[PDB]
Amino acid sequence: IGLILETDEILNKKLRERKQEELQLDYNPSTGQSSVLILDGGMKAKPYSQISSFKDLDFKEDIAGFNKSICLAFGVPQVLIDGGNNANIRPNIELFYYMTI
Amino acid sequence: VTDLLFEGCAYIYWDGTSLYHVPAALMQVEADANKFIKKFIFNNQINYRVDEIIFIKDNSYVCGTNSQISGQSRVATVIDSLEKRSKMLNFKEKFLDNGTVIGLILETDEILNKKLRERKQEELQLDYNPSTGQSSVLILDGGMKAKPYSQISSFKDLDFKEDIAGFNKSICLAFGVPQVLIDGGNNANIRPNIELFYYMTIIPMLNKLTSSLTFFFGYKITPNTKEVAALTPDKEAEAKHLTSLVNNGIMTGNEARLELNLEPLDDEQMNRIRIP
Amino acid sequence: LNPGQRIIRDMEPVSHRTNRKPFTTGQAYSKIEILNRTANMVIDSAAECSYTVGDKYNIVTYANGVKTKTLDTLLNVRPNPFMDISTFRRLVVTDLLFEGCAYIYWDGTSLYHVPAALMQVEADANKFIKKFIFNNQINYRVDEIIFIKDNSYVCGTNSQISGQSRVATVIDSLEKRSKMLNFKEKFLDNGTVIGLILETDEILNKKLRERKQEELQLDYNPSTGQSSVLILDGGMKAKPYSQISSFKDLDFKEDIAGFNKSICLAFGVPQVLIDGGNNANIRPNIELFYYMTIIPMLNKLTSSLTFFFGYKITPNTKEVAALTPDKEAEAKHLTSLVNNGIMTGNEARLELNLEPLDDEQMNRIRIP
Amino acid sequence: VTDLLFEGCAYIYWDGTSLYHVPAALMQVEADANKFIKKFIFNNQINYRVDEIIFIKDNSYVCGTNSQISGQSRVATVIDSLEKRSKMLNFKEKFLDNGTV
Amino acid sequence: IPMLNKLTSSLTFFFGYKITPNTKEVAALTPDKEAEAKHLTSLVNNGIMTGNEARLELNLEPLDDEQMNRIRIP
């Protein structure tokens, strides 16, 4: 939601819908220029907040754990999934070959 | 290689003295009851005899049966991720076009002449912005109230960055190309990673192909990398390797010339071991 | 021949283009910096590889019987009486990259670039290709064209004949990035910056109110004026307010960086070449860029020329000043091979670009 | 080098035993129907014969056509940014003079 | 160097001579006095390069003593 406006009056539905589309196209900087808004006749702007946010879906470590489990069940080092430095890479191939295969 | 990667199979006709690629999407393999394969069917419209096709297949475990005959597509496992990532990217864009950016809210219980109200809005908008205009203090009279507000949903909460990075890693991993090749790193990173990519990913594919050709022709057949400019070893190490083996009488001179791509030289001594 | 050909022919009887959006692509290349730079780096780097002409295979071919010295002069020196070698190469590489195909006419003793956007390929029912159609207005015979194509997987068919455009995959990102940048600008011009709000229930003489606003504005700013305390009387109230939407929430920086990486990746140029790094970074990265990206392209081209002429043909990098090896290592390599009697002296002179010296010993191996 | 960088083209006359720079902003190239280039036109007011000019051009991809003859300016791609930066800097200054303390 | 290669390739097309740019006048590039001496000395003593070729690369006039234009084998 971008904005909430509120009244105790009853408003003509067709004109209300038109007004919503005018505000939406005018205020966005991509579409339109206008930015100040003047309310009259008692329309009130209602403050609100994002009651549930994408920020709380910090899955990132849990899925990483599952990837490690899968990678571990076969027994392939992560350096082979990434590629690292020389000192990492050349011994890890021998690790993978000798221990697993 | 396109057919082998995307479909998971490849077929080649042979015609005495010709090899022809045959599109893998149109072939079909029919199992024999006694031998391995009875015939190959193309587009349901022609049957190739078994001794006239060279057949290659990737691994296959299907519907809970380990599968002879069939081949798993490699690329088929990646599409799920390409969809989700595209969705996020489109959402990331479209939130901006659906956006709504307010600078100020003014409010009254009176009713105001609409045409003059619109003019006043345009005057305030052009005057207050520093780019357009100078004025900055605002004096309200007759009871217009300034209403405090807040951005009820913000772009800050679209921290997609790690999730899309995960999807890129998945795609990059399905082919099996190290990220150092997508970035470029330091020397110690870069030079071994090329050998990692070549030996682990490509050489098993070519071993599948060459083992099928050695089965068909019966010759020993195997791939040579040493034409590849990417792999070609360092001019320093190779010289000390070859020199030390040559002087200690393990390897003849012309064998070294050959390994350096040079024509053998017919001086007999060049095909002699030197003991000391 | 191939019994299936009559069927394959019907799967794709005529080529079709893949560089849709040609106009917006030409706009992008003409207007967006990172595309222009990366494309120019690729074209200008590939154009300066020399070609070496090798031995001749005995098999028969189309371009029969051409003497090696002529072919060498055409490839290395002068493609035709009217156009240089560098312009010819850059045109061919431009077509190969942008459209995904390249075509070259041959006319006894001339090679001419033919624009890839106007050619079309018609499949034969028995052989590979029947004829090439230019602008629907002239047909070239098959043994008079050299044809190159990039990979192609189209509409769920692996595609002979056709070629995928490389650049076509990048436009989606160039649009989105431009949108963000324009939004990033325009939010500033749509902005609104208030310094103070004063309020009354009385009604005030408009002309005097405007004068008072201009007096306060000029007086209070430290650049213009001195005064800083403010005394309000008669009931003017100062209304507290807050910035209801702030520039701080436009933290675009990583998203646009992602799009730059995508563009940079589509050509396959390492970021170290866009930045410049340390020596250990920089010197290997040039070899990475050359060998992985450019040399496969030139191998596509040279394999098509060896098919057409029948000579062995392959590209030589050793003219390239960027690649040319370190003066120290090369000397110890060559010296050690020469003294240990693996390589003759004149072979080393040759590798150092020096003319062979006719002293017989210079063409002898020295054993000790 | 100035002409080659800024305009994207450079032209040099030759006169037996003289080379003269010819300003790239005033030259124009006319395509031949059989050969490469028919003649060079200077300021619409003199035509140079083809064997009397040395011609250099940077890369060119224009209006969706890969372009012979023409050359892309290098510097032309930079102006968009120089404007925006200047705007920010001016705003950064003027906020201080519009200030109120 | 790509810019100058564009220019020189146009001049070689026009005149027909081989034409190419030399950097070695550029004071910025000019190599380190230590490395260059060991490079040149080692190539000269091992009989790959004649003496006057080294003088030339050091911007020195060739010296007319015949031996200076001879290879020394050992």
Numbering used by the authors:
A (entry chain B): 204 to 304
B (entry chain E): 103 to 378
C (entry chain D): 11 to 378
D (entry chain C): 103 to 203
E (entry chain C): 305 to 378
The authors write:
The T5 family of viruses are tailed bacteriophages characterized by a long non-contractile tail. The bacteriophage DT57C is closely related to the paradigmal T5 phage, though it recognizes a different receptor (BtuB) and features highly divergent lateral tail fibers (LTF). Our results provide a complete atomic structure of a T5-like phage, provide insights into the process of DNA ejection as well as a structural basis for the design of engineered phages and future mechanistic studies.
The portal protein (PrtP) forms a dodecameric ring, which replaces one of the MCP pentamers of the capsid. The PrtP ring interacts directly with a ring of head completion protein (HCP), also dodecameric. The interface is completed by a hexameric ring of tail completion protein (TCP), which connects to the first trimeric ring of tail tube protein (TTP). Furthermore, our cryo-EM map resolved the secondary structure of the N-terminal part of the TMP as a trimeric α-helical coiled-coil. Second, we found that the neck tunnel at the HCP-TCP interface is open in the pre-ejection DNA state and remains open after DNA release.
